[PDB]
Design a protein around this ligand. Structure first.
Ligand code: ATP
Ligand code: CA
Ligand code: CA
Ligand code: CA
Ligand code: CA
Ligand code: CA
Ligand code: CA
Length: 903
DNA sequence: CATGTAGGTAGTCCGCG
DNA sequence: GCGGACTACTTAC
């Protein structure tokens, strides 16, 4: 096989690399790497190295990496550019793997682990590590085994061995319900003292040294706890055995009363699954406990146990250990679904970076671009210092707040990257400037044509047309991968709707799910077979299709994020190719594009409807337009339609066969105007929205910029079995909004859009009557606990103290002295409830760590003093008032002359 | 050590015979 | 109590 790296580190003048050799064996090696950097030299000097602007360079080959670094400083002091890759391990990877890396994940040791630490005196701080580690579960991907390390004897209790037999039993039979598919994969190892456990864990670690290390919160808890605990018991050099190169760095972040730390283990790539999840999932959760996320992702129940976690080992060691095992498995289950490790490996090896550097788009792109330029013997520029400077972004249209009955939306495929490719925006493709007119003059095609030689953006920049830029070149590659995967995702989505339609008429038979590839639209033959399948087989197929869609979503959305990240990095001062001329060339072009195409669409629709000056585009944001299709429907007359699907078909066809071609013509004209390199503004129909035919539903509404709701029947070619709400910005989409209020607001919206005012009023009335019976957590608001200390004046709120921070302070006073109450952690999420006047907490609100029940000591009083009236008013009624006044209807029947009668 | 800007809601403060 | 500045939190792109 082809060789590929696992990890790379620079330590002094040595590169330390772990890799897979040609026989698929894991190897390690130390290399005294001899780096090169470069300097401009005179034209006369014949060379094979040129900078990206074609200026000749001379290679400086160094004896060691220290000399290279030293040289960079001397050049800085002289005042001359020091070119080349200054992150030497990227150069090493580039020299060592001068080819497209094909890696085999089965050779990569991916470790997933989690530890337990009984602590009777509060949270067990990793920096102090003063309590025994009494359980570790460590899953190894190469062995496919869960290695369980169980402490039987501790100063907090001596316990019996854990029973795998009881673990496998159903919880309703007193077992722990450890999933049956991992029972045979568990290797259980009890220990009579902690030192032997830890010694054996280290020996185990040596034999099975993680390459990728993950788990839930491992970076902020498990890893620093294990490191510091081993350090305190055996000494630091023993602790350093967690690094295959025996080197670590201890990052101490000053949390103030007290503190915590991150440990860097050289030769390992730590990918904390919480960080992967936050970067790659595109969710905004109110809690990030493993219980919450597992139930969200997997629909599995919360791990239930009686009493506090500090007493679980002593009271029920059996359950303690099972839950340690299960917690580790749940991360594997989430990853089986989401495939973030696979994505990390894909992206890492594509870029030729340390795998943990996928968290940094700047590092990722720096490596991609360096490797691309190196292949052509070109030399990358020195990184420079720049002051932070705000710059303009997208255009968002001010909508008229209203109900909007029939709406069709369109937007640009991969807008900013397409702009980069169309205009040819790169550091080395800049050809000059032109004198800019006001943007509106370009939008209305009255400004002079910027150039008939170069490709232009309305920010004043000109670019070469006849040569490739490294930015366009490399952004196109990732874009094309993105496009591939989104096709797979959308096919699986369409495939899923077919299955949902068939589930309306399941067959009474015993059969199996069809063996199909869900990434491709089902053939007619497959669809015929599906119409005869049973419910059981159909439901299994739907699950598989949805998993295929999620996998495709992970792959496409994050490659989208990567290329959009390249456009943004051009406006980040730490990016090697930072340049506001290029950043603003993109955003300014985008502003012109949206407003140009608004004009063109209004012109076109007026023409075909035989009218003049009517406004068809009602809204747009960055690269999208929203078109009122009311006059389109009225032209033919609603009477002509047989059902909802018929008018949907009609608008679908109208957009495809009439509008999109008019849009393409409009954009081709814009392209000629800017004399761009390549026409790539492809604005395809997104949503088709309206009320069901014959209903009193309003179809949709806008309250303002970035705030609207649409009843959608077709989305990017997916014709839904059941209409789906597209809601943006409204309170239903906000993690700060209480969970049950999101639900109730969404149902208010559904009724408004699908059923009408009377339906809304009926629901509003019921919810108002039943509000007070909802579970307290379900109606608590959520917020992030930032800068708590800043407003903490003697345990009381300082000036300008935010509401949520005030609630945290109230909480801290209420739990003072109580050692079991969980502390609010700086930066983390909290539930928040308002409190009636005169409450025993002595303030207007309370807040506690999210994803948890509030400690039993104060829970009773919180429940007793909750202010339901404030809560209903602020979280539900006030947002609903916004929706309904915008839509021009009432959530409560207004008084009128009719009130005089008895109906 | 290092993607971007645009934009709405709701909080505190402060003015207000 | 209500409604402007000033701003934290948060989401749409
Ligand atoms: N997270 C982000 N970081 C930087 N720029 C972004 C981000 N999200 C959106 N943008 C900018 O807004 C543009 C339009 O956003 P949009 O969500 O329509 O995605 P897109 O890149 O056009 O891809 P799609 O083909 O899925 O529409 C992007 O091309 C850019
Ligand atoms: Ca635990
Ligand atoms: Ca788009
Ligand atoms: Ca699209
Ligand atoms: Ca059937
Ligand atoms: Ca868009
Ligand atoms: Ca109490």
């Amino acid at each position: 096989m082809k060789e590929f790296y696992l990890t790379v580190e620079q330590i002094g003048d040595s590169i330390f690399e772990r890799y897979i050799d040609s026989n698929g064996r894991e190897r390690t090696r130390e290399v005294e790497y001899k780096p090169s950097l470069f300097a401009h030299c005179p034209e006369s000097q014949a060379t094979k190295y040129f900078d990206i602007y074609g200026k000749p360079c001379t290679r400086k080959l160094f004896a060691n990496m220290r000399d290279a670094s030293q040289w960079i400083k001397r050049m800085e002091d002289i005042g001359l550019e020091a070119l080349g890759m200054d992150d030497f391990k990227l150069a090493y990877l580039s020299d060592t793997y001068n080819y497209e890396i094909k890696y085999d994940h089965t050779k990569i040791r991916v470790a997933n682990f989690d530890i337990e630490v009984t602590s009777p005196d509060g949270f067990p701080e990793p920096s102090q590590a003063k309590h025994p580690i009494d359980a570790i579960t460590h899953y190894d991907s190469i062995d496919d085994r869960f290695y369980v390390f169980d402490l039987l004897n501790s100063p907090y209790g001596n316990v019996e061995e854990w029973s795998i037999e009881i673990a496998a039993k159903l919880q309703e039979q007193g077992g722990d319900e450890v999933p049956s598919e991992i029972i045979d994969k568990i290797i259980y190892m009890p220990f009579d003292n902690e030192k032997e456990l830890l010694m054996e864990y280290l020996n185990f670690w040596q034999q099975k040294t993680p390459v990728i290390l993950t788990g839930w919160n491992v970076e902020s808890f498990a890893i620093p706890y294990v490191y510091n605990r081993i350090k305190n018991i055996f000494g630091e050099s023993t602790a350093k055995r967690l690094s295959p190169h025996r080197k670590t760095r201890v990052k101490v972040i000053e949390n103030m009363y007290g503190s915590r730390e991150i440990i860097t283990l050289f030769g390992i790539s730590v990918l904390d699954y919480i960080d992967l999840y936050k970067k790659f999932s595109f969710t905004n959760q109110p809690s990030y406990s493993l219980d919450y996320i597992s139930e969200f992702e997997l629909n599995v129940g919360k791990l239930k146990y009686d009493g506090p976690i500090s007493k679980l080992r002593e009271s029920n060691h059996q359950r303690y250990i099972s839950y340690n095992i299960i917690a580790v498995y749940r991360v594997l289950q989430i990853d089986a679904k989401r495939q973030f490790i696979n994505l990390s490996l894909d992206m890492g090896y594509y870029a030729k970076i340390q795998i943990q550097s996928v968290f940094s788009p700047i590092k990722t792109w720096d490596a991609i671009i360096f490797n691309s330029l190196k292949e052509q013997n070109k030399v990358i520029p020195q990184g420079r210092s720049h002051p932070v400077q705000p710059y303009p972004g997208a255009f968002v249209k001010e909508p008229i707040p209203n109900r909007y009955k029939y709406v069709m939306s369109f937007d640009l495929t991969s807008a900013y990257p397409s702009i980069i490719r169309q205009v040819n925006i790169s550091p080395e493709t800049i050809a000059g400037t032109f004198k800019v007119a006001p943007l509106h003059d370009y939008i209305n095609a009255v400004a002079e044509r910027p150039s008939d030689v170069y490709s232009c953006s309305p920010n004043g920049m000109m670019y070469y047309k006849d040569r490739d830029g490294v930015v366009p070149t490399e952004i196109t590659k990732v874009f094309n991968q993105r496009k591939e995967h989104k096709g797979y995702m959308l096919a699986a989505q369409r495939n899923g709707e077919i299955i949902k339609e068939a589930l309306h008429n399941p067959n009474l038979s015993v059969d199996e799910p069809l063996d199909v590839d869900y990434r491709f639209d089902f053939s007619d033959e497959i669809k015929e077979k599906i119409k005869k399948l049973s419910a059981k087989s159909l439901n299994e197929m739907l699950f598989r299709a949805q998993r295929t869609e999620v996998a495709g979503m992970t792959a496409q959305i994050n490659r989208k994020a990567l290329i959009n990240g390249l456009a943004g990095a051009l406006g980040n001062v730490w990016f090697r190719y930072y340049d506001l001329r290029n950043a603003t060339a993109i955003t300014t072009f985008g502003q012109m594009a949206l407003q140009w195409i608004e004009r063109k669409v209004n012109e076109y629709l007026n023409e075909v409807c035989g009218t003049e000056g009517e406004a068809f585009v009602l809204y747009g944001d960055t690269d999208s337009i929203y078109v009122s299709a009311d006059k389109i429907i009225d032209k033919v007359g609603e009477s002509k339609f047989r059902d909802t699907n018929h008018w949907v078909d009609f608008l679908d066809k109208f957009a495809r066969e009439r509008m999109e071609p008019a849009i393409d013509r409009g954009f081709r004209e814009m392209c000629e105007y800017m004399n761009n390199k390549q026409h790539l503004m492809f604005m395809d129909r997104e949503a088709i929205a309206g009320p069901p035919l014959g209903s009193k539903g309003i179809g949709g509404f806008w309250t303002g910029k970035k705030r609207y709701a649409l009843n959608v029947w077709d989305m990017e070619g997916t014709r839904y079995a059941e209409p789906k709400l597209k809601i943006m910005g409204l309170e239903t989409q906000k993690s700060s909004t209480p969970k049950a209020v999101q639900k109730a607001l969404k149902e208010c919206i559904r009724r408004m859009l699908q059923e009408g005012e009377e339906s809304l009023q009926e629901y509003f009335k019921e919810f108002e009557k039943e509000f007070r019976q909802l579970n307290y957590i379900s109606i608590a608001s959520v917020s992030s606990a930032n800068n708590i200390a800043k407003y903490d004046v003697g345990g009381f709120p300082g000036p300008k103290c935010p509401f949520h921070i005030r609630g945290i302070l109230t909480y801290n006073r209420a739990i003072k002295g109580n050692i079991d109450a969980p502390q609010v952690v700086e930066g983390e999420k909290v539930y928040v409830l308002p409190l009636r006047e005169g409450n025993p907490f002595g303030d207007k609100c309370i807040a506690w760590p999210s994803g948890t029940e509030i400690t039993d000591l104060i829970k009773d009083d919180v429940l007793h003093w909750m202010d339901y009236t404030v809560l209903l008013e602020k979280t539900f009624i006030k947002p609903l008032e916004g929706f309904t006044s915008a839509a021009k209807l009432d959530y409560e029947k207004k008084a009128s002359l009719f009130d005089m009668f008895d109906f």
